[PDB]
Amino acid sequence: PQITLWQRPLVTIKIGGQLKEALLDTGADDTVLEEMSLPGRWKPKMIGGIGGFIKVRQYDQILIEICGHKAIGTVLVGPTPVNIIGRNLLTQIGCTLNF
Amino acid sequence: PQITLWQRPLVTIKIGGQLKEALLDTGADDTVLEEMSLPGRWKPKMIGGIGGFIKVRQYDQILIEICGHKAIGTVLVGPTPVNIIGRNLLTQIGCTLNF
Ligand SMILES: CNC(=O)[C@@H](NC(=O)[C@H](OCc1ccc(-c2ccsc2)cc1)[C@H](O)[C@@H](O)[C@@H](OCc1ccc(-c2ccsc2)cc1)C(=O)N[C@H](C(=O)NC)C(C)C)C(C)C
């Protein structure tokens, strides 16, 4: 669909069978989700943004559904104030910025 | 144009007569630019990012060209890693997310 930016581009995502609200963030290299449990091994990682760095846990090969579209990729879990769907997954659903 | 997200959506912007690279950031409510000189008085503003909050200087009615599209709006200047073009300006250039 076509999402306007008058409001934050929040969409519903399905991950781990859980429905969550996440932000489609073209400014995010990675996908960062709030603290949650994911299966498998993870690697510690520091990701920076506005305000500095936060420590997150990196999970690879994670399946996420974004507006019906399935996508696979790395997901970072940590104390982020909002769920962020970064470019690593936006590319997988054919998301493009247009004007 | 149509921008894919396999790489950061960096574009050249023109502000204060200078060229700078900035990120088309749908995850940003506001436009935040790296430390620079702008005219007029500024007002304080606290903005939150993934790593916490930062104090920024808010300048209003600032002329900024984004990929040839002239925009005039609020710009925040502060300790940001990269120049961020947020929704306040993305909407002025008719930018939308599509997939
Ligand atoms: C490599 N690192 C990245 O790609 C990071 N990208 C960014 O931080 C983007 O910023 C460009 C950016 C790119 C590279 C580096 C970088 C780092 C190290 S080397 C390069 C630093 C910054 C991003 O889209 C921000 O803009 C936006 O983050 C989402 C967000 C939205 C609402 C709240 C939130 C907070 C309180 S309630 C909701 C909290 C967070 C955000 O902070 N939005 C703010 C906002 O809208 N707040 C409401 C806005 C005022 C700036 C990833 C890991 C998240």
UniProtKB/Swiss-Prot annotation, chains A, B:
Role noted for this protein: Aspartyl protease that mediates proteolytic cleavages of Gag and Gag-Pol polyproteins during or shortly after the release of the virion from the plasma membrane. Cleavages take place as an ordered, step-wise cascade to yield mature proteins. This process is called maturation. Displays maximal activity during the budding process just prior to particle release from the cell. Also cleaves Nef and Vif, probably concomitantly with viral structural proteins on maturation of virus particles. Hydrolyzes host EIF4GI and PABP1 in order to shut off the capped cellular mRNA translation.
Active site as annotated: D25 (for protease activity)
Part of the whole protein covered: 501 to 599 of 1447
Organism listed in the record: Human immunodeficiency virus type 1 group M subtype B (isolate BH10)
Domain Peptidase A2: residue ranges: 20-89
Superkingdom classification of source: Viruses
UniProt feature coiled coil, ranges: none
Annotated stretches, region: Dimerization of protease: 1-5, 49-55, 88-99
Protein name: Protease
Subunit text: Homodimer, whose active site consists of two apposed aspartic acid residues.
